[PDB]
Design a protein around this ligand. Structure first.
Ligand SMILES: [Ca+2]
Ligand SMILES: [Ca+2]
Length: 1287
């Protein structure tokens, strides 16, 4: 167990547990410090840490020590005996809290027993030298007022009070002659500057601190966790594993880049969580090797140590036994020490990945910041840690009987205000970048608000080095993980070996290197005329001495006038916000503008499914203008085109090394070693893929995800500024009124703020999801593929290497010169899929990844869309698309392939996308419109098959072809084996749903079947289990290829490819999404237009058509004529028959040019009667259920309704529309829907039934039924002449 001693500052010096110490950095010259032994080998010195600091630097100034910290200064802290005693009792309480749990008690025991080796790099292997500043520290025995007698003592840790900056805790190791024992396996006396009362504050980006933008946000730290964080650094320094290696360094070449000190891997390990993932597997192994090498040196020393010259009283065996246990070396029957790989591996991982702030926080149920790279906030002062009503050894601030155990309420600033006090900003120093415009206006920006972007020098290039493949070579992986539970239960982890006595000979060699610290300017001037995130955020604020503001959508005016505040919300919102009303209308206006705010904020849930983008926050560009001028133009459109990339402030230059070659060692004649060598190269190859991926992840986390973090914080500040601005206006307007008026105004500010805050929280969640999606998108589409390229290239090179090796050694492989090549061929075939969880176990990162992978749209590897008069790939993988001159394109995303040699599209797909999942797994979807056969060319139409889309590489691939009325999907594997599945629509139908009409096609492929879906429905299926590998990323050629008629053509739209099999559910959804339009369609599926001649079709009476009756102002219904020739293969009913109707716009006299007919539009349904344009009317006064429509010349009569509203009652995709007559546009009085009705006629000679063009109220109720009745006689379609249909 661990015993924590008790004592008061005024207790007498006894030269044993209470001493007068001569600190290492004192160089043995004057001034001793009263020190207290809190536990064995651990001392507390309740005084400010002054080594290396100027006395005046303890006062707040115009300077700062660290550029990434809100520094608090207070030269009076610890300036009295009573203050020193409070510090002591507080440290005693914190150590008790630490050992209150096994994990922390274990940390303390490891630290107490991790005694520094007796010596350093300068000591002969055969000796123990205690006479060095990193091993022995002196205590003054003599009476006060005389350095008469001094005694030496061994120590592990000395904790001082804070240096100039109270909240800047730090652990310091001892360097002598430019070298650090604590970094070379020996370990050495560790020192710390610590302050328990002034703790850091942090706030979860995703999590909302009690969700209260008007109250204090964030959480304050548990000083016991802060202490344990530093103790972990102590632990590393004591075991001499605080090695230096390739550090993470921030890029500082641009004015928007955050400046910080270099960050060593050890610091990130200490924190834990996701931070270790920023240290590449390459650097992880480099550090492991350095520490292991350091331990080899110590184990050698233990085998050679013979004497201790400095202290004749040192018992050599006792120390050898102790050091053997410290480093977990093994000892043979004769006392020979050696390194045990298993024990070393366990010790190393326990020290680097077991004891981490994250792991400890989780075990002690203490809340802490999410990452070392989170923004720093001003600290707070804990009122009294010695008061058990506020802080306890067992629970810290989160005391259960105070109901503050849940959700870490005890550390919540908005909830546990009784626990802390805010700090005087007067004593705070913060490093700021002053961005001033050219002559100039200047804006101060806290260095913490800038973008942290790791420089490329931060990452290891070890992957570019060559590797020797021996027969015993093995691949190595260092898991940045460690079972915290096994650590807590690990028996032999803790020493049961006697701790040697601390008294030794006095130190006489005080040689030591003492750090010198200096403040630097707290403000750095930089010139820039850029208006990026910092300026946009700034334009949304107003001075404290101003209370009357107005909102504006003009960023420039907002900058210029102190009374103008920028807003990225709608024009209307801005207008209403600036509205002034009478007291009697104030409450109404408040409810209105507050509601408007919530509506505006909520636009953050905007969907864009037609562009294959599920979520998009439309106003991000206007709010921050971050990245590539995102405030200009339409953000949604700019995003559909370039994606996540447009939001980045800086595109990083990634390190993606050419993997070094493999040098397989030769073992002539020996066959066993030769085979082993082969396999080792293979397994090592995988280590290369994994390490490369780790390299990518590390860079993504420290150069890309960091920028997206800044953006998330920026949107939080932006939305808050907006709410604050609206609140300022509401207050100003309310205070203009008299007290008498105010008394009659029904307003509740707490409710106003509650509503504004809730809207912000909703917006924040959407924004966080959107941004995380963008970040992962960039990783998967803009980073991983670049790595895959290098890795595939490496594979090819190695393949050649190995095969050859098999050849030069075939004379030793006897009956395996074949078996080995096969194993190699298949191995370098299946590539390694990227799995983020392999490089990190952080919950938010993993769920971020899993979410992205669960969204079917991220499986799109090709998405040809129209943009700026051209077809381009918006999938995000950057396919090269060459559209030749003979391809017709329009803004409706339709493209036409003709019989011309230059009517072609060439697509070069990205070769670095995991398309080969070993087994076929992909889908292709697109819309198509195939022209009707030429009646005099039916034989060739049914006989000649022609390809339309071909994707082949090395004689393998897929293709889409057509043979008359059949569309065919064909696969060809590497062996030339072929299989096809097809859809054939009937060409003998009176009325076809497919011929010359737009329809949706979807082809899915999995390991077993190949199926074709048409308009969301499964139509055909083929068993393709016998199909071997199919190369599918070859060049895609869109072009009619075969024996086609010169008039042959094909229209296509929305061609896309998914690297997975779409489900019937996904397909049905895509069909509905791509079918949607505000406008109605015509018979062929194209947009319905005004001023366009159309024949009319009735879905409920397919073979019927309308004709003006000879001597009657009515439309008689006749039977369509039909295909007349003798071909046995075809049949249809004529479509270009009956009156030629034309649709006219009701309002706006913007002439009769043309335009799109939209649902709900009011129209006139006219038609041509020879040289005149007639109209369709409805006699107003009929009492029956239905009546014949009145067809006559254009004119206005009180007796006839002439206005029609075009409707769409079907909720599912259809080309039918309905026509409604309403009393008038405003009324809700429905006269009826246009249809066909049957009448009985009995004349003097003829007796029969005849159908007429009518209006009927009966349809009104029928169109409400579900599922929609497609057969209703009120369903019409408009047929314009089309080159794709001849009769
Ligand atoms: Ca790592
Ligand atoms: Ca302003």
């Amino acid at each position: 167990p661990v015993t924590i001693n008790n004592f008061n500052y005024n207790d007498p010096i006894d030269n044993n547990n209470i001493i007068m110490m001569e600190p290492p950095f004192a160089r043995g010259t004057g001034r001793y410090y009263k020190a207290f032994k809190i536990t064995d080998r651990i001392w507390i010195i309740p005084e400010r840490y002054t080594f290396g600091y100027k006395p005046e630097d303890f006062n707040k100034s115009s300077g700062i020590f660290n550029r990434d910290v809100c520094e608090y200064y207070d030269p009076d802290y610890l300036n009295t005996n009573d203050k020193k005693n409070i510090f002591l009792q507080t440290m005693i309480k914190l150590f008790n809290r630490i050992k209150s749990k096994p994990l922390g008690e274990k940390l303390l025991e490891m630290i107490i027993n991790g005694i520094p080796y007796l010596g350093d790099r300068r000591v002969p292997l055969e000796e123990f030298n205690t006479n060095i500043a990193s091993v022995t520290v002196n205590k003054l025995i003599s009476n006060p007022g005389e350095v008469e007698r001094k005694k030496g003592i061994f120590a592990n840790l000395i904790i001082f009070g804070p240096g100039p900056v109270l909240n800047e805790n730090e652990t310091i190791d001892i360097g002598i002659q430019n070298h650090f024992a604590s970094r070379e396996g020996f370990g050495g006396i560790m020192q710390m500057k610590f302050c328990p009362e002034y703790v850091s504050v942090f706030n979860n980006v995703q999590e909302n601190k009690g969700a209260s933008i008007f109250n204090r946000r964030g959480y304050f730290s548990d000083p016991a966790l802060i202490l344990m964080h530093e103790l972990i650094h102590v632990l590393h320094g004591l075991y001499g594993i605080k090695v230096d290696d390739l550090p993470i360094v921030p890029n500082e070449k641009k004015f928007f880049m955050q400046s910080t000190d270099a960050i060593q891997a050890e610091e990130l390990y200490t924190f834990g969580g996701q931070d270790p993932s920023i240290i590449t597997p390459s650097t992880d192994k480099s550090i492991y090797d350095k520490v292991l090498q350091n331990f080899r040196g110590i184990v050698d020393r233990l085998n050679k140590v013979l004497v201790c010259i400095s202290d004749p009283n040192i018992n050599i065996n006792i120390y050898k036994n102790k050091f053997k246990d410290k480093y977990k070396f093994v000892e043979d029957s004769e006392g020979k020490y050696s390194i045990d790989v298993e024990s070393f591996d366990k010790l190393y991982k326990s020290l680097m990945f077991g004891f981490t702030e994250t792991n400890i926080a989780e075990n002690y149920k203490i809340k802490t910041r999410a990452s070392y790279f989170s923004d720093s906030l001003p600290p707070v002062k804990i009122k009294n840690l010695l008061d058990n009503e506020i802080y306890t050894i067992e629970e810290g601030f989160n005391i259960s009987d105070k109901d503050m155990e849940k959700e870490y309420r005890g550390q919540n600033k908005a909830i546990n205000k009784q626990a802390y006090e805010e700090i005087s900003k007067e004593h705070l120093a913060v490093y700021k970048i002053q961005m001033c415009k050219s002559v100039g206006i200047c804006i101060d920006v806290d260095n913490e608000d800038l973008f942290f972007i790791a420089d490329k020098n931060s990452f290891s290039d070890d992957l570019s080095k060559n590797e020797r493949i021996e027969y015993n070579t093995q691949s190595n992986y260092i898991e940045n993980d460690f079972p915290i539970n096994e650590l807590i239960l690990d028996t032999d982890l803790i020493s049961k070996i006697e701790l040697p006595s601390e008294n030794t000979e006095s130190l006489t060699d005080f040689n030591v290197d003492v750090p010198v610290y200096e403040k630097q300017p707290a403000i750095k001037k930089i010139f820039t005329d850029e208006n990026t995130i910092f300026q946009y955020l700034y334009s949304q604020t107003f001075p404290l001495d101003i209370r009357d503001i107005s909102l504006t959508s003009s960023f420039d005016d907002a900058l210029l006038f102190s009374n103008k505040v920028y807003s990225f919300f709608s024009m209307d919102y801005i207008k209403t916000a600036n509205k002034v009303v009478e007291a009697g209308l104030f409450a109404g206006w408040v409810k209105q503008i507050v509601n408007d705010f919530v509506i505006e904020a909520n636009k953050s849930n905007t969907m864009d499914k037609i562009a294959d983008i599920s979520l998009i926050v439309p106003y991000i560009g206007l709010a921050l203008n971050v990245g590539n001028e995102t405030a200009k133009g339409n953000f949604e459109n700019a995003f559909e085109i370039a994606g996540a990339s447009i939001l980045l402030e800086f595109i990083p230059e990634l390190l993606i090394p050419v993997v070094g070659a493999f040098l397989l060692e030769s073992y002539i004649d020996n066959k066993n070693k030769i085979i082993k060598t082969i396999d080792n190269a293979l397994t090592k190859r995988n280590e290369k893929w994994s390490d490369m991926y780790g390299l990518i992840v590390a860079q993504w986390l420290s150069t890309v995800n960091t920028q997206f973090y800044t953006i998330k914080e920026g949107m939080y500040k932006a939305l808050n500024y907006q709410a604050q601005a609206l609140e300022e206006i509401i207050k100003y307007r309310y205070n203009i009124y008299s007290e008498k008026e105010k008394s009659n105004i029904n307003i509740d500010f707490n409710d106003i703020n509650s509503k504004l805050n809730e809207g912000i929280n909703q917006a924040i969640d959407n924004i966080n999801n959107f941004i995380n999606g963008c970040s992962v998108s960039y990783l998967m589409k803009k980073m991983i593929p670049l790595a895959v390229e290098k890795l595939l290239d490496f594979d090819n090179t190695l393949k050649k290497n190995l095969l050859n090796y098999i050849d030069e050694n075939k004379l030793y492989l006897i009956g395996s010169a074949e078996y080995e090549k096969s194993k190699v061929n298949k191995y370098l075939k299946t590539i390694m899929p990227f799995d983020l969880s392999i490089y990190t176990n952080d919950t938010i990162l993993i769920e971020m990844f899993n979410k992205y992978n669960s969204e079917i749209l991220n499986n799109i590897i090709l998405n040809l869309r129209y943009k700026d008069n051209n077809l381009i790939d918006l999938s995000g993988y950057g396919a090269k698309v060459e559209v030749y001159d003979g391809v017709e394109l329009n803004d409706k995303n339709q493209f036409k392939l003709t019989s011309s040699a230059n009517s072609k599209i060439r697509v070069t797909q990205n070769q670095n996308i995991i398309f080969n999942s070993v087994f076929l797994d992909f889908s292709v979807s697109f819309w198509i419109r195939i022209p009707k056969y030429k009646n005099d060319g039916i034989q060739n139409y049914i006989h000649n098959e022609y390809t339309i889309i071909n994707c082949m590489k090395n004689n393998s691939g897929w293709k889409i072809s057509i043979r008359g009325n059949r569309i065919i999907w064909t696969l060809i594997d590497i062996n030339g084996k072929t299989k096809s599945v097809f859809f054939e629509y009937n060409i003998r139908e009176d009325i076809s749903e497919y011929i010359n009409r737009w329809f949706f096609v979807t082809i899915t492929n999995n390991l077993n079947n190949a199926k074709i879906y048409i308009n969301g429905k499964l139509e055909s299926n083929t068993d393709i289990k016998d199909i071997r590998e199919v190369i599918a990323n070859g060049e895609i050629i869109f072009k009619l290829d075969g024996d086609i008629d010169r008039t042959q053509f094909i229209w296509m739209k929305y061609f896309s490819i998914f690297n997975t099999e779409l489900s019937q559910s996904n397909i049905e959804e895509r069909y509905k999404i791509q079918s949607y339009s505000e406008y109605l369609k015509d018979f062929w599926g194209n947009p319905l237009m005004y001023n366009k001649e159309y024949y009319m079709f009735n879905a409920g009476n397919k073979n019927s058509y309308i004709k003006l009756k000879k001597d009657s102002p009515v439309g008689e219904i006749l039977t369509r004529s039909k295909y007349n020739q003798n071909s046995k293969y075809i049949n249809y009913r004529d479509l270009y028959i009956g009156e030629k109707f034309i649709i006219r716009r009701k309002s706006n006299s913007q002439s009769i040019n043309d335009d799109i007919v939209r649902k709900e539009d009011y129209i006139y349904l006219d038609f041509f009667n020879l040289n005149q344009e007639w109209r369709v009317y409805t006699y107003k006064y009929f009492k029956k259920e239905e009546e014949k429509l009145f067809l006559a010349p254009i004119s206005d009569s009180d007796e006839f309704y002439n206005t029609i509203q075009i409707k769409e009652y079907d909720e599912q995709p259809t080309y039918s529309c309905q026509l409604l007559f309403k009393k008038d546009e405003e009324s809700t009085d429905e006269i009826g829907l246009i249809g066909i009705h049957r009448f009985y006629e009995s004349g003097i000679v003829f007796e029969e039934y005849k159908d007429y063009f009518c209006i009927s109220k009966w349809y009104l109720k029928e169109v409400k039924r579900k599922p929609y009745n497609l057969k209703l006689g009120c369903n019409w379609q408009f047929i314009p002449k089309d080159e794709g249909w001849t009769e």
